[PDB]
Amino acid sequence: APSRNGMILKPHFHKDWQRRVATWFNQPARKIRRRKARQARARRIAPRPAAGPIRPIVRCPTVRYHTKVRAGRGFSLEELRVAGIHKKVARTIGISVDPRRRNKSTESLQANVQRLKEYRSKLVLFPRKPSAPKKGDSSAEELKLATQLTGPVMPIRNVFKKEKARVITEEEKNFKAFASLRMARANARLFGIRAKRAKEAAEQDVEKKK
Amino acid sequence: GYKYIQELWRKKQSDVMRFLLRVRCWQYRQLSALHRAPRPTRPDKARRLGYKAKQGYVIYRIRVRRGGRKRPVPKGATYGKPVHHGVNQLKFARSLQSVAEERAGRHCGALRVLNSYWVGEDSTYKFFEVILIDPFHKAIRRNPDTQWITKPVHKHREMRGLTSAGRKSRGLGKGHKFHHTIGGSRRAAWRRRNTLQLHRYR
Amino acid sequence: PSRLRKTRKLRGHVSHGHGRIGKHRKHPGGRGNAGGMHHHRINFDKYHPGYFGKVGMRHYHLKRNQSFCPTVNLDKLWTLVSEQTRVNAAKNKTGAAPIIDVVRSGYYKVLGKGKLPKQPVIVKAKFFSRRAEEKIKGVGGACVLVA
Amino acid sequence: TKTWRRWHRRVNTTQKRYAICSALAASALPALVMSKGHRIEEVPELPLVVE
Amino acid sequence: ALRYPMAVGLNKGHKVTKNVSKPRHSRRRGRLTKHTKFVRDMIREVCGFAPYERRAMELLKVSKDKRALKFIKKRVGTHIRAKRKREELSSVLAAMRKAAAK
RNA sequence: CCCCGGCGCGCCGGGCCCGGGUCUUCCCGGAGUCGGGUUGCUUGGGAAUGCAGCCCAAAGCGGGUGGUAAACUCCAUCUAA
RNA sequence: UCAGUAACGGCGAGUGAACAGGGAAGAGCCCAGCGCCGAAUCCCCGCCCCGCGGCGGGGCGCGGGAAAUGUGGCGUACGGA
Ligand SMILES: [Mg+2]
Ligand SMILES: [Mg+2]
Ligand SMILES: [Mg+2]
Ligand SMILES: [Mg+2]
Ligand SMILES: [Mg+2]
Ligand SMILES: [Mg+2]
Ligand SMILES: [Mg+2]
Ligand SMILES: [Mg+2]
Ligand SMILES: [Mg+2]
Ligand SMILES: [Mg+2]
Ligand SMILES: [Mg+2]
Ligand SMILES: [Mg+2]
Ligand SMILES: [Mg+2]
Ligand SMILES: [Mg+2]
Ligand SMILES: [Mg+2]
Basic residues: which segments have biased composition (chain E)? Predict the structure, then answer.
């Protein structure tokens, strides 16, 4: 029975919920399991980055988030072809590669190319044969000063270009923003019916001739 | 060549293929319900479904009676609320092809089911052919392209609904149509949606 | 703390705080929100008016991020930039106007409620309101749009 | 008794820090230490620091 | 004029320089080859036509086109598939005419 | 002090005779399946989310999806069986 | 987290997801088909030497089979030859 004044609250407890109860008493006993296997992994991959292969720079969909930048899954084969890295050898120097990604823009394609250059320049390569160096391989002076990098590799940080204070012109003060918004919204909500009404104005006013 | 038998087996409404499918269906209707075939009836569809013409690969032909699943209850009398008074027009949730693959995977329990296909039907029967693999031959043990099937994880793929015809019945997949099977399966989705996560600190 | 609760003073009294005439039975009104239209109508009308019925159009596949638009008012518009930008524009004499980028702070629309300090600004934002733009002209300033 | 009883409590960080600063500001008072029971009648100075 | 990018309107959106690439090889699928066409017609000439395309052809001979399209739509399903099946069922008919014409 | 294993380095007998870049000529796909009707169950999925039975039954610049049924025309998106 | 939300529902009781985003983890691939290659491939038995307690390595057999109703190598939608 409801009291005087309160909420109409619907509790979702009409199923046998006591059987399927999930308690988190092993959360501290699994955080240590994850950390232990994360340092067994950071010891299995000795000089390779501890976070893993480098990820590209990636905008987000969904206008809620389409101004932040993120770390994608891999570098599209287009960006690998521009950077000059075979798609089957990229995965062996810790470069991430997913083929599913497209590249519609260019401002991001060149950003990820510059990213591959900034990684293939920071890359210290060890020679396949230890007792014998090779051609494309960092020299032993690097290899002795080559450490294991912690955290993400080349971390991605949202930056904003600092624009200094200008002086406002009378063309900036002439710009009616709210009117321009309501006008573009009208000219877009009405574009189809306007074009059809003018196709009718041009399909009727021709009959008068023939 | 194989694409000629392929584009031919799509004109099932033609004359030649309605003569062949009908003499096949008549001959099948006279043999046993589950009998071993000497060789794959459709060699092209068999390759497409994974049949290498080498030792160890077996083809069983099996027929199943068409129609829905009458409810196994007394005369009428399904004691319950009028919602569940249905007996006649009910349907089974597993395809007749999965029932063929599991009557083969049960009649011959040593062999591992790979896939199956349709070779004929009539008003009272549907005829399938199941591609069974012998997982202890050496043509399959040593060949590393197919030694996955010999591990104990793939026991009774069709009793666990992992063949193609079975997977087609569990409504799994990626998309906005397959939301009720996010996670392992329908019951592993149901469990996580109907499971109350009670953290330590709430 | 049970030692603070009310069932520690209720030991020894027969009805345990619940009545001699009318007992504490299990569900003497039905379970949950039962009788919203029959015997709990005075309560569902005195306290939850409009709880019964339909209104408006449905929208099947609603996605809550197409309609994302967090707003910021003019009163706390000058709080998005540092203090040495508003006072630097005070001490400024070459008429330069600081550029306040709002979508960089996390708002799309600018509503104009508060007063403004008398100095020019260049407000970059996605959507503007009529009054929010008039309060900016009336102080001298530009309403830049950014798609 | 069930096992989903609320066993653990969470406290605001600024309040755990208020409590730490209040438990340190109270360890430099001869009365608040001689009243907890400690026998410090001959300690040369309360904030006892050593090399 | 002072035109700005706008979140709304007829050309809304942040402005990027749209690059071009070779279209994915996936989209290529479905297109006929000069060999798969030869197999399709070389089996059309072996099998023939369906018992309902033998009827659609006789309905397109007397030029009862609306009924001959409602028949195909009822018999095969979607209107797009019916229209696309009728177009070829009339191209083959003009072939069986430009054949025995001489 | 015993045993197991890994990570290691030599040696033998084997393998394997191998890559990328630019042009040129070529080739490229999974059917009683998709799909439509209808029936039953299921789903938040509402002019059918999914599945299944029965009937019809494909195409290949095609096919599916783009959360309201239908026709027209554009585009996005993958490439099922 | 979205979310007790969109939606379902004698639109009553009640039921009720997904997208995006932040995290743990992080890895891809393989066929049929289409072609190219003297079937270039596989299993089994007999004998030699070793290895031998997870039944293998190498050599011989005008030894037997499977397989042209298609074995092996290249190759699979990110194109490939
Ligand atoms: Mg009361
Ligand atoms: Mg699997
Ligand atoms: Mg299907
Ligand atoms: Mg009393
Ligand atoms: Mg009593
Ligand atoms: Mg009381
Ligand atoms: Mg009472
Ligand atoms: Mg009570
Ligand atoms: Mg009444
Ligand atoms: Mg049921
Ligand atoms: Mg239900
Ligand atoms: Mg997401
Ligand atoms: Mg992580
Ligand atoms: Mg292969
Ligand atoms: Mg082959």
Answer: 12-30
